[PDB]
Design a binder for this molecule. Structure first.
Ligand SMILES: NC(=O)c1ccc[n+]([C@@H]2O[C@H](COP(=O)([O-])OP(=O)(O)OC[C@H]3O[C@@H](n4cnc5c(N)ncnc54)[C@H](O)[C@@H]3O)[C@@H](O)[C@H]2O)c1
Ligand SMILES: NC(=O)c1ccc[n+]([C@@H]2O[C@H](COP(=O)([O-])OP(=O)(O)OC[C@H]3O[C@@H](n4cnc5c(N)ncnc54)[C@H](O)[C@@H]3O)[C@@H](O)[C@H]2O)c1
Ligand SMILES: Nc1nc(O)c2c(n1)NC[C@@H]1CN(c3ccc(C(=O)N[C@@H](CCC(=O)O)C(=O)O)cc3)C(=O)N21
Ligand SMILES: Nc1nc(O)c2c(n1)NC[C@@H]1CN(c3ccc(C(=O)N[C@@H](CCC(=O)O)C(=O)O)cc3)C(=O)N21
Lengths: 292, 292
C-alpha cells in the first residue's frame, strides 16, 4: 500500500505560509498584493481554474481581479491590455489563462507580460533564467510537483526520475528543476532524469520507468502508467488531467493498480492540482516583494 | 568494428558550405562578415582554440580579429569593450573565450553580448529561445554534436540517448536539442533522453547507457565510458577533453575497448573538436545575414 499524498493538505500548508507572509508584508506598511488574471473566452475548465485561483488569493489575503474578454479580442487589443497592466504599479502579478483562441499567438502574449510580474514563469527570460539555474519566477505546476516531492521528504539526489511529457509549461521545467545542481543559484534536485514524450515507444518507456525511483506523468493519457511499469516502492506523481467516460476526471496513472506497488502516489483530483494554485500564490507574494 | 567518424572530414564539408555561402553574400554586394573574439589572459589551450577559430574564419572568407587583454582587466572595462563591439556595425559576431579570471562574472559577460551577435549562444535570451524550441543562435559544440549525428545518418526519433554531463554550455543544450519536437520552429531530435551528471551513481549510469542507441559523453572523465556500458551497435560521441599522462589528450571514452562494441564512435582529438569550430563559422554567417 502506497502512501496517498494529499495535495489538498500540502496546499493548505503552503497557503497558511503565504497568508502569514502576506499578513506580515501588509502589517509593515506595504501595499496588499494584487493579482490580475486575463481570461479570454468561455472555456469551462478555464473558468473553473481561474475561480480556484481567485479564491485561493482571497484566502491568503491577496487582492485579485479577473478581467474577462470575448474570444473575438484581437491580439493587438490583448497586448494593449497587457501593457496597461504591466505599467500599473498596483498590479503585482499578471497572468493570462491559456489556452487562447487560435488567432492569437500564445508565445507573443506570454512574452509581453513583464518578467517581474510573470507569475506563470512563461516569459522567455524567466525560461532562460530557469534553464541556467538562476533565480526566476518558476512555473506553478512544476514548482507544485517539486514541492510535493520535497515536503513529503522523498529524496532526489542520485535518484532515477522519469518524466513522461516534454511540454514547455509542465514537462520541460519539471525535468529541468529535478536534474540540476543543488549547489547552483536556484538549487535543483540532482536526479538522473529521463525525458520521454509522444515518440518514445511504450516498450522503451517501460524499460526506463522500471529503473525509476520517481515517475512523473504529464502526458494526458489515461492509464499510461500501470503497475508492471513501476518498481516496488517508487514515488508516482500524476500531473495528467483527462476527461474520460457521464464525463469523468482521471490522471495518467492507473491509480487502483499502481497504489498496490508504489511507495507514494498522488490522486487526480486532489493531487498536483491544488498545488498548482498554491504555488501561484507564492509567486504573487514574490512578485509583490520585488525580490527578483 | 565501429565506424570511426572523422569530425575533421565533416568539418571540412561544413566549411566548404560556409565558404560558398559567404562567397555568395559578398558577391551580391554585402559587407564581408566579421568575427571579433575577446581573449583574456594567457591560458594556452584558450590561445590554441582561438587560433583554430581565426584560421577557420580565414579559410571560409570571414574577417576576424582577436582582441587580447590581460587577466587584470576589470569587469567594467571588459563590459565597456563589449558595448563598443555590440555598437559597431562592422562587427557581425562577437564571442568571449572562456574561461575568464575568477574576479569576472561570466554570466554577466555572456549576457552583455548582443543577442544578434552572440555566436556562442550563451546569452540568456538565446538560451530561453532554445529551451522553447524557437530559432536561436545555438551553441557551437552542441550543434557540432547534432551535426555529426545528422550528417552520419544516425536516427534519433524514438531512440534512447544518454548524455553524461549537464553543463549549461554543452550537456544541457545537447539534451535539449536531442529530445525536442521535430515539428517545432527549431526542430529537435525526438529522442528519449537521459541526463546524467556528477551525482549519478556509476551503477545507474551503466543501467541507462546499456539501453542507449546513442551515448554522448561530456563529463571530462577519462574512461568514463567503457565497452560493458554500451550496447552492441550503439553510436558513441565523445565530447570530453582530458589532459592525462608526457601530458596527453584523451576523451571520456575508452576508445580502444569501445571501438570493438559500438556501431559508431568519434575520436579525441579529431572528433567533436573540429565540429565545434566549423559550426561557429556557420553562426557567424548567420549573424551577418541578420536572419534572426
Ligand atoms: N494537475 C495540474 O495542475 C496540471 C497543470 C497543467 C497541466 N496538467 C495536465 O498535464 C497533462 C499535460 O499537460 P501539458 O500542458 O504539458 O500538455 P501537452 O498536451 O502540451 O503535453 C503532452 C506531453 O505528453 C507527451 N506525450 C504524448 N504521448 C505520450 C506517450 N505515449 N508517452 C510519453 N509522453 C507522451 C507529449 O509529447 C507532450 O510533451 C494534461 O493532462 C494536462 O491537463 C495538469
Ligand atoms: N570537443 C569539444 O569541442 C568540446 C567543447 C566544449 C567542452 N568540451 C569538453 O567536454 C567536457 C565537459 O565540458 P563542460 O564545459 O561541459 O565541463 P564542466 O566541467 O562544466 O561539466 C562537466 C559535466 O560532467 C558532469 N559529470 C562529472 N562527473 C560525472 C559522472 N561521473 N557521470 C556523469 N557526469 C559527470 C558534471 O556534473 C558536469 O555537468 C570537458 O572535458 C571539456 O574539455 C569539449
Ligand atoms: N496561464 C496559465 N497558467 C496555468 O497555471 C494554467 C493555464 N494557463 N491553463 C491550464 C493549466 C491547468 N491548470 C490547472 C489549475 C488548477 C487545477 C485544479 O485545481 N485541479 C483540481 C480540480 C480538478 C477539476 O475539478 O477540474 C484537482 O484537484 O486536480 C487544474 C489545472 C492551470 O492553472 N493551468
Ligand atoms: N566562449 C567560448 N566558446 C567556446 O565554444 C569554447 C570556449 N569559450 N572555451 C572552451 C571550449 C572548448 N572549445 C574548443 C574548441 C576547439 C577545440 C579543438 O579544436 N579541438 C581539437 C584539437 C585538440 C587540441 O589539440 O587541443 C580536436 O581535434 O579535438 C577544442 C575545444 C571551445 O571553443 N570552447
Amino acid at each position: 500500500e502506497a502512501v496517498v499524498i494529499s495535495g489538498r493538505k500540502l496546499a493548505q500548508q503552503i497557503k497558511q505560509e503565504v497568508r502569514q507572509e502576506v499578513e506580515e508584508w501588509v502589517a509593515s506598511g506595504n501595499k496588499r498584493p494584487h493579482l490580475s488574471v486575463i481570461l479570454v473566452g468561455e472555456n469551462p475548465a478555464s473558468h473553473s481554474y481561474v475561480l480556484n485561483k481567485t479564491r485561493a488569493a482571497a484566502v491568503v489575503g491577496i487582492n485579485s481581479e479577473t478581467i474577462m474578454k470575448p474570444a473575438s479580442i484581437s491580439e493587438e487589443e490583448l497586448l494593449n491590455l497587457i501593457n496597461k497592466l504591466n505599467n500599473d504599479d498596483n498590479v503585482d502579478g499578471l497572468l493570462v489563462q491559456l489556452p487562447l483562441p487560435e488567432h492569437i499567438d500564445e508565445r507573443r502574449i506570454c512574452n509581453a507580460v513583464s518578467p517581474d510580474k510573470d507569475v506563470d514563469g512563461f516569459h522567455v527570460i524567466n525560461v532562460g533564467r530557469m534553464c541556467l539555474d538562476q533565480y526566476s519566477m518558476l512555473p506553478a505546476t512544476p514548482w507544485g510537483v517539486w514541492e510535493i516531492i520535497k515536503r513529503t521528504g522523498i529524496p532526489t539526489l542520485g535518484k532515477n526520475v522519469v518524466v513522461a511529457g516534454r511540454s514547455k509549461n509542465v514537462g520541460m521545467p519539471i525535468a529541468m528543476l529535478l536534474h540540476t545542481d543543488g549547489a547552483h543559484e536556484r538549487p535543483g534536485g540532482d536526479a538522473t532524469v529521463t525525458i520521454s514524450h509522444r515518440y518514445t515507444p511504450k516498450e522503451q518507456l517501460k524499460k526506463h520507468t522500471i529503473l525509476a525511483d520517481i515517475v512523473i506523468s504529464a502526458a494526458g493519457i489515461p492509464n499510461l502508467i500501470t503497475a508492471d511499469m513501476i518498481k516496488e516502492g517508487a514515488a508516482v506523481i500524476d500531473v495528467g488531467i483527462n476527461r474520460v467516460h457521464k464525463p469523468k476526471l482521471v490522471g495518467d496513472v492507473d491509480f487502483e493498480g499502481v497504489r498496490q506497488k508504489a511507495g507514494y502516489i498522488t490522486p487526480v483530483p486532489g493531487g498536483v492540482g491544488p498545488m498548482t494554485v498554491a504555488m501561484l500564490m507564492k509567486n504573487t507574494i514574490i512578485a509583490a516583494k520585488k525580490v527578483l
